[PDB]
Ligand binder design. Structure first.
Ligand SMILES: [Mg+2]
Length: 666
DNA sequence: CCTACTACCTCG
DNA sequence: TGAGGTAGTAGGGT
């Protein structure tokens, strides 16, 4: 079932010979810099030279003639002040089919765009973003509307425009004028004289004229020495703290600070965004000399709608609260009220009783008559509950302090009980909140509430997540789904490539328990965010235990946007691009702006791409703790993310007191 | 490319 | 602590 789509990219004219044959320029820096310092330097030199020049190798490339560039000059990096001399080395014709050359050409194109935007009338320009309309204004502020553009070169030697509409919140005032309008104090603020930012702590009346500043002159005298005040006598003392270490305070002036405004002190329907993409594309196209922008169309396919099921077919995990679960053994749940009231609110008890009745499962509801503020007796009531088949506890409480939330969760978890919080006051009308809480509680108690009916290539699908930003050197989490759902952690700084295999191996082991075999083929999912080689060991071991596998990277960005040529916009959209890579629009709702397609890469294995798309998109529905909206990412990745978030939150790098079939972290 | 924060709007 | 995605904002001396 195929269709056709638009991407938010636009084809423009092919590059002329002069652009294919740009000026090449050698660079010398006195003093000669190191090895891990030369590149940032060269970029700085390229900005310094002026014109449409970029870095190429250890030199520069330009579309502007040497005669309008700044050939000799002075510069300052990390203390070392350099002098640079440029030497024209002729014109080097680059080929777009060559990736390195094309990368240089694309840099030159981005430069071209930036320069053409800078010399443009009537618009408000910032970087590669252009803003054309005032969408809102207020006493001292503004919300501009426009688009973030991009411009690169295809391997075919042609320009490519990318357009995505956006708003920009701007402040037209200094901090003092902002405060003089009676507006509240912003959390973040900026130097009016440079780009450094701070967090605003408070105000001070320790007058600016008489405020000693580390050996010598005063606040005012200091700032006036650097010619920042430029005549004007600045405002009152603003106490500001550099974002890094908020412990140490630093004096400043409200007349030299500019509020950094957030929406705290603006989304578009897909159809509107499509429109404005078109409009802005046309305008930029006219204002450049790039020609007529022609939107790139792509072949797409409509994946089949997943068939969720409980004790009867279902559309969302909430209807299982009426219809019954997929797998429900006997359960005992327990209530703990941190407020003053007693017993279950009747609607929760009723919903639980119905759901279990319609599943042929027994349900026991215990009520903990103890308070978290009794250490010993509370732990005794806890163990008494646990020793009577209690599998999870629901917590009715006022909004908790964060630290107390963490403490309570930790305490209950260590005695062996996963926990769900639901805030009071709580009306029966607040349907989605307590239904969501109930689904969460059920999933934490070990229940399989929904499952996918269908034939899937990989019997087991596991997704990973790292504790560190860029390696698994700190661990450490994995989640899997058949189909039953499990999680895995490492066991208390390690060789990054070993952690991954540890997680995968245990996962396979749990599968060996509950299923009695090893899986035929498996689906390995990673959110990229890591080098591939951290998986090499796992890939080889997988190929050594005789297990078939696929490795797919799943990224949230870099796919741009996808619109339909005609008709309505739906999910289950699979857009093939080429070599092992594809877009996948997993999730969308009308009121929910415009969807952002996921970008997926097929790194290992050799299963048909469409099949992988099918299963991944289907796993989009298997997350059981939402219940009204499906996650954008496949359940294993979503769950893995939540798991490391919760491990970091609770600090449970050592937790062997809870079963791995229970999803305590939702 | 990635995270975090708050705001918004609904509830496959 | 209900949760989802899409928005905006930020981040990868004085
Ligand atoms: Mg939760």
């Amino acid at each position: 079932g195929k269709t056709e789509v638009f991407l938010n990219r636009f084809a423009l004219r092919p590059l002329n010979p002069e652009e294919l044959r740009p000026w090449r320029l050698e660079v010398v820096l006195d003093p000669p810099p190191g090895r891990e310092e030369v590149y940032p330097l060269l970029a700085q030199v390229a900005r310094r030279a002026g014109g449409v020049t970029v870095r190429m190798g250890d030199g520069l490339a330009s579309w502007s003639p040497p005669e309008v560039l700044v050939l000799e000059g002075t510069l300052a990096r990390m203390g070392q002040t350099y002098a640079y001399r440029l030497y024209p080395k002729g014109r080097r014709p680059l080929d777009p089919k060559d990736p390195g050359e094309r990368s240089v050409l694309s840099a030159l194109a981005r430069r071209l765009l930036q320069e053409r935007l800078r010399r443009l009338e009537g618009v408000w320009v910032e970087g590669l973003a252009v803003y054309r309309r005032e969408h809102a204004r207020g006493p001292g502020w503004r919300v501009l509307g426009g688009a973030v553009l991009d411009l690169w070169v295809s391997d075919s030697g042609a320009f490519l425009l990318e357009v995505d509409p956006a708003y920009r919140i701007l402040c037209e005032m200094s901090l003092e004028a902002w405060l003089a309008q009676g507006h509240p104090l912003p959390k973040r603020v900026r130097n009016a004289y440079d780009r450094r930012t701070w967090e605003l702590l408070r105000l001070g009346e320790e007058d600016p004229k008489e405020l000693p500043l580390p050996g010598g002159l005063s606040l005012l005298d200091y700032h006036a020495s650097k010619g920042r005040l430029q005549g004007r006598e600045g405002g009152r003392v603003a106490w500001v703290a550099d974002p890094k270490d908020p412990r140490k305070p630093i004096p400043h002036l409200t007349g030299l600070l500019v509020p950094v405004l957030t929406l705290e002190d603006l989304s578009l329907p897909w159809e509107e965004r499509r429109r404005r993409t078109r409009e802005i594309a046309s305008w930029i196209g006219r204002r450049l000399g790039l020609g007529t922008p022609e939107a790139v169309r792509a072949q797409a396919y409509r994946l089949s709608i997943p068939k969720l099921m409980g004790r009867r077919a279902v559309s969302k995990p909430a209807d299982a609260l009426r219809v019954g679960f997929y797998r429900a053994q006997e359960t005992a749940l327990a209530l703990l009220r941190l407020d003053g009231a007693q017993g279950w609110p009747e609607f929760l008890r009723r919903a639980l009783l119905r759901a279990f009745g319609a599943s042929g499962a027994s349900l026991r509801l215990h009520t903990l008559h103890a308070h978290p503020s009794q250490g010993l007796a509370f732990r005794e009531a806890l163990r008494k509950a646990k020793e009577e088949g209690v599998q999870a506890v629901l917590v009715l409480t006022p909004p908790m302090a964060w630290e107390d939330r963490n403490r309570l969760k930790a305490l209950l978890l260590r005695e062996g009980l996963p926990s769900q919080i639901l805030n009071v006051p709580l009306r029966e009308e607040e349907r989605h909140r307590w239904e969501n809480a109930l689904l969460g509680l059920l999933a934490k108690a070990g229940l399989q509430v929904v499952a996918l009916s269908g034939a899937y290539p990989a019997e087991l699908a596991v997704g990973f997540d790292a504790g560190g930003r860029e390696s698994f050197r700190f661990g450490g989490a994995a989640c899997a789904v058949g189909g039953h759902l499990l999680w895995t952690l490492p066991e208390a700084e390690r060789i990054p490539q070993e952690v991954v295999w540890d997680l995968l191996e245990e996962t396979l082991w749990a599968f060996r328990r509950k299923a009695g075999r090893l899986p035929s083929r498996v689906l390995l999912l990673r959110d990229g965010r890591v080098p591939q080689d951290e998986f090499a060991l796992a890939l080889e071991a997988l190929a050594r235990e005789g297990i078939a596998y696929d490795l797919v990277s799943v990224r949230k960005s870099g796919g741009g946007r996808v619109y339909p040529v005609q008709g309505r916009l739906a999910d289950g959209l699979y857009v093939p691009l080429e070599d092992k890579t594809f877009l996948l629009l997993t999730v969308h709702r009308d009121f929910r702006g415009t969807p952002r397609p996921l970008k997926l890469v097929h790194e290992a294995g050799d299963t048909p791409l469409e099949a992988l798309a099918h299963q991944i998109f289907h796993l989009t529905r298997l997350y059981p703790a939402s219940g009204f909206a499906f996650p954008r990412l496949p359940a294993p990745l979503h769950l893995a993310d939540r798991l490391v978030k919760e491990v970091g939150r609770l600090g449970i790098r050592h937790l062997k007191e809870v079963d791995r079939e229970k999803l305590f972290f939702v």
